[PDB]
Amino acid sequence: QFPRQCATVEALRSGMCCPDLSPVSGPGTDRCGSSSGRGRCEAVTADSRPHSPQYPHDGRDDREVWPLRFFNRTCHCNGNFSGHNCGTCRPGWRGAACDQRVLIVRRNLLDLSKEEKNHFVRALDMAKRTTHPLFVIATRRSEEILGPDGNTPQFENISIYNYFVWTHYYSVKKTFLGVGQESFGEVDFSHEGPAFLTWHRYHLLRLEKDMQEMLQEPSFSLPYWNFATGKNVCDICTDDLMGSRSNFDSTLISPNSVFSQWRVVCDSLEDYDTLGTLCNSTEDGPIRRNPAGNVARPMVQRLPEPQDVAQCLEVGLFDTPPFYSNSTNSFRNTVEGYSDPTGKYDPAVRSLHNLAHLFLNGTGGQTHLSPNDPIFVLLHTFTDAVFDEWLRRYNADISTFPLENAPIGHNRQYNMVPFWPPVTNTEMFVTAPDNLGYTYEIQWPS
Ligand SMILES: *[C@@H]1O[C@H](CO[C@@H]2O[C@@H](C)[C@@H](O)[C@@H](O)[C@@H]2O)[C@@H](O[C@@H]2O[C@H](CO)[C@@H](O)[C@H](O)[C@H]2NC(C)=O)[C@H](O)[C@H]1NC(C)=O
Ligand SMILES: *[C@@H]1O[C@H](CO)[C@@H](O[C@@H]2O[C@H](CO)[C@@H](O)[C@H](O)[C@H]2NC(C)=O)[C@H](O)[C@H]1NC(C)=O
Ligand SMILES: *[C@@H]1O[C@H](CO)[C@@H](O[C@@H]2O[C@H](CO)[C@@H](O)[C@H](O)[C@H]2NC(C)=O)[C@H](O)[C@H]1NC(C)=O
Ligand SMILES: *[C@@H]1O[C@H](CO)[C@@H](O[C@@H]2O[C@H](CO)[C@@H](O)[C@H](O)[C@H]2NC(C)=O)[C@H](O)[C@H]1NC(C)=O
Ligand SMILES: *[C@@H]1O[C@H](CO[C@@H]2O[C@@H](C)[C@@H](O)[C@@H](O)[C@@H]2O)[C@@H](O)[C@H](O)[C@H]1NC(C)=O
Ligand SMILES: O=c1cc(CO)occ1O
Ligand SMILES: [Zn+2]
Ligand SMILES: [Zn+2]
């Protein structure tokens, strides 16, 4: 979403989001850090190609051709510089000249020290309460973005971790069609399509970076939860990490965990889809969680089996046509969890990443809310580990990642919605140790 200095009337009407870095000579004199050689304000590249025929409402939705409905000029940064005003570095690089390499290690949460476990939990909690220093979220679609009087931008501050929740919601929300009409839901800019793995990889990377700056700890890293244990229970749902079941309500989190204090955003879908508004920063009820609780649906009462991870890493093509939740022999669709681990599509099957979401039988299993439960972070870093191992094992073969005819939002060169600055799926389709500055300490079965 947008740098708080781009969420003004001036910026939105010019279509330019090219903020200053250190504007010595006055405003506008250091856009994109051009005085320092770090970047320059220039035209946005956005994907032109056709998408699948499943979305019929070209022209109606602000997530189309992202971000051209809001800005047509951004900062491009030179070299290994990066960020909304080119004032930081590309993933894997540090220093004022962005010329020092770093490599941080993402580890299994159960293998951390008592002190490292406590530091992680207290850091999530701080992110939940700490206002994001750069990004503000929009509460109205673009037509009403400047407010009733036309001069009041409809943006709100939000916490670091609620930003993480918001962007996932924005990429899954329905297309508003107008009051009186049913909003359109056959669209998902981050699920059911080739962009699944790369969307969520940038999602994690932006959170890791935000927390590093919040803690001032360059080497802070996000752990993972190995959920492919076949267990009846959530082995990380304990009060020293992530929270156990409350004894007073079997669908709430233990009061001995900070996460029982969290309150969720984006849970008023009735309003958003009828009034045409967006999720805002006001929090509501608590997290609901009930591991193995879905008696009505016995298939989602046990976690994926260790063999399932072995099997899906044998699927060799990243994706297959029609590039959707009914793709067969698609590694994206297998690890996302709409195929079985072998790649066999069946409308009833729920494996791997999907299964892990449904196992929680609660807030974590509802697509518009699931990042509110912080197990989301650990569930997706493990999914990203599987992604990374595939990228290594098949030499990052991006050839099956379609350039066109994918569901809207999922073409290879689509800017992932709504990340800022614009970033394409191609930019995340690399092995993480050599290119993004992080690696997984992990061993795979066979
Ligand atoms: C680049 O953008 C400018 C600014 O227009 C805004 O850009 C988008 C956010 C979109 O939502 C527009 O509605 C915004 O107005 C464009 O300049 C304006 O273009 C509109 C046409 O939509 C025109 O009616 C206005 O009079 C123009 N105003 C100014 C100050 O230029 C410009 O055309 C865009 N260039 C492109 C897309 O190549
Ligand atoms: C996967 O699902 C899609 C969407 O349901 C199927 O594609 C076509 O979907 C259109 C609407 O976009 C329907 O009108 C058609 O009935 C579908 N095409 C047919 C039946 O040829 C697609 O067929 C599915 N792929 C499978 C099942 O392999
Ligand atoms: C932020 O979102 C909340 C939740 O949707 C909004 O509160 C709702 O406001 C509408 C007014 O149209 C009421 O009908 C709902 O009953 C309210 N919901 C709750 C849970 O109180 C809130 O108004 C939004 N903020 C802004 C500035 O739009
Ligand atoms: C969690 O699982 C329970 C089942 O254990 C779900 O509750 C059932 O929901 C279905 C369909 O919504 C109903 O037909 C059943 O009658 C419900 N059973 C009970 C005992 O409530 C619940 O919806 C699930 N919630 C989430 C978020 O996954
Ligand atoms: C959003 O909040 C603004 C405050 O901005 C700054 O945000 C963080 C870094 C905190 O350290 C805070 O103390 C800072 O002042 C306010 O000016 C205002 O309420 C909000 N502005 C908009 C445009 O929503
Ligand atoms: O991605 C998700 C998948 C499921 C189950 O399919 O629930 C929530 C999600 O965010
Ligand atoms: Zn998701
Ligand atoms: Zn997910």
Side-chain angles (χ1 to χ4, degrees):
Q1 194 65 353
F2 301 137
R4 76 198 333 121
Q5 53 261 62
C6 287
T8 62
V9 152
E10 172 195 322
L12 284 156
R13 285 201 215 152
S14 73
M16 179 181 303
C17 181
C18 291
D20 287 302
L21 188 48
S22 201
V24 287
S25 314
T29 67
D30 193 32
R31 301 190 173 271
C32 312
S34 56
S35 59
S36 330
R38 302 180 72 103
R40 72 169 193 192
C41 185
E42 71 186 22
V44 169
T45 319
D47 191 56
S48 324
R49 312 224 184 183
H51 55 81
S52 90
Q54 174 175 32
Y55 178 72
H57 296 95
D58 287 8
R60 312 297 297 283
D61 190 304
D62 291 334
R63 302 170 278 179
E64 306 161 15
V65 194
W66 175 260
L68 284 177
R69 303 290 160 79
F70 302 93
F71 305 103
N72 55 26
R73 326 258 284 140
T74 48
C75 296
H76 169 60
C77 309
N78 299 316
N80 289 311
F81 298 113
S82 201
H84 68 103
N85 58 359
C86 300
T88 189
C89 304
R90 286 199 156 260
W93 292 100
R94 292 189 57 83
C98 297
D99 59 340
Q100 312 183 29
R101 279 208 186 200
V102 274
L103 175 72
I104 66 168
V105 185
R106 291 192 182 163
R107 309 180 63 207
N108 183 319
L109 178 65
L110 295 185
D111 297 335
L112 299 174
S113 69
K114 185 177 88 162
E115 314 88 53
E116 290 171 327
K117 299 179 168 185
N118 188 248
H119 185 58
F120 175 64
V121 170
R122 297 178 62 75
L124 273 181
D125 196 54
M126 189 181 168
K128 178 89 183 187
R129 316 183 321 256
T130 308
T131 278
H132 203 302
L134 176 69
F135 299 126
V136 297
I137 55 135
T139 73
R140 305 286 178 262
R141 292 141 50 256
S142 67
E143 316 193 335
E144 332 160 276
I145 196 68
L146 291 182
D149 66 352
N151 202 146
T152 307
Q154 298 299 285
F155 289 95
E156 288 181 358
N157 291 307
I158 194 141
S159 71
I160 290 156
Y161 192 86
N162 288 331
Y163 176 71
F164 184 79
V165 179
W166 188 91
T167 53
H168 189 261
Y169 149 83
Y170 189 77
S171 77
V172 307
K173 67 159 224 197
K174 298 189 171 172
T175 296
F176 186 60
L177 287 171
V179 309
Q181 318 184 45
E182 207 171 90
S183 308
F184 185 76
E186 322 303 325
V187 56
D188 195 327
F189 285 76
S190 52
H191 306 76
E192 317 180 69
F196 171 61
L197 290 174
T198 45
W199 192 101
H200 283 91
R201 160 168 292 190
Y202 185 90
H203 196 214
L204 292 171
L205 202 59
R206 177 86 244 184
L207 178 62
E208 203 172 54
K209 161 114 172 164
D210 280 341
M211 285 170 86
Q212 284 162 1
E213 297 172 354
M214 172 197 71
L215 308 164
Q216 302 197 250
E217 300 182 11
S219 64
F220 175 85
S221 73
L222 293 184
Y224 62 85
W225 164 37
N226 166 29
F227 60 71
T229 55
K231 285 185 192 170
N232 230 347
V233 303
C234 156
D235 49 27
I236 64 167
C237 291
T238 67
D239 281 348
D240 61 317
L241 43 70
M242 308 326 296
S244 48
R245 204 182 316 257
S246 159
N247 281 324
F248 311 106
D249 192 329
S250 47
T251 64
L252 292 179
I253 292 174
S254 158
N256 204 21
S257 171
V258 284
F259 301 123
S260 67
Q261 300 166 20
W262 283 22
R263 305 287 184 255
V264 305
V265 294
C266 303
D267 198 14
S268 303
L269 280 188
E270 224 186 24
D271 299 345
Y272 312 142
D273 295 346
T274 73
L275 310 189
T277 55
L278 301 181
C279 171
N280 61 48
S281 64
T282 285
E283 309 181 346
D284 205 5
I287 301 162
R288 299 270 164 186
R289 192 193 297 158
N290 197 357
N294 194 338
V295 283
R297 196 169 169 189
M299 189 194 177
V300 302
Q301 285 184 294
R302 164 157 274 113
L303 288 162
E305 295 289 348
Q307 305 65 70
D308 302 339
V309 174
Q311 288 183 297
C312 84
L313 289 173
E314 317 292 10
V315 181
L317 303 180
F318 181 78
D319 214 337
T320 64
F323 311 104
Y324 190 63
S325 31
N326 57 7
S327 274
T328 200
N329 295 327
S330 169
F331 169 79
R332 188 276 310 160
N333 211 48
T334 295
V335 76
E336 185 177 355
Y338 294 105
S339 315
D340 73 14
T342 280
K344 180 164 157 172
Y345 169 74
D346 182 336
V349 70
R350 288 302 198 267
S351 74
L352 296 163
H353 155 273
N354 285 348
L355 185 59
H357 269 286
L358 300 174
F359 183 69
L360 303 178
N361 173 230
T363 309
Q366 316 176 39
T367 318
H368 67 287
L369 290 176
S370 47
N372 278 292
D373 188 329
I375 297 191
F376 189 92
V377 179
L378 312 145
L379 188 161
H380 267 289
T381 52
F382 181 71
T383 310
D384 190 64
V386 181
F387 179 36
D388 212 49
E389 171 69 9
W390 185 97
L391 288 174
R392 171 192 82 61
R393 193 176 289 194
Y394 302 88
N395 209 61
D397 187 2
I398 200 171
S399 50
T400 44
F401 200 134
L403 290 151
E404 53 185 22
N405 300 321
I408 181 179
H410 289 255
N411 284 349
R412 189 192 306 169
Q413 297 291 141
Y414 218 101
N415 292 331
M416 303 177 297
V417 195
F419 293 129
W420 196 268
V423 50
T424 59
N425 292 289
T426 306
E427 284 162 83
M428 290 293 108
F429 208 101
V430 299
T431 58
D434 285 351
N435 310 289
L436 300 166
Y438 71 86
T439 183
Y440 291 98
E441 177 186 63
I442 192 173
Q443 271 158 231
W444 307 99
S446 178

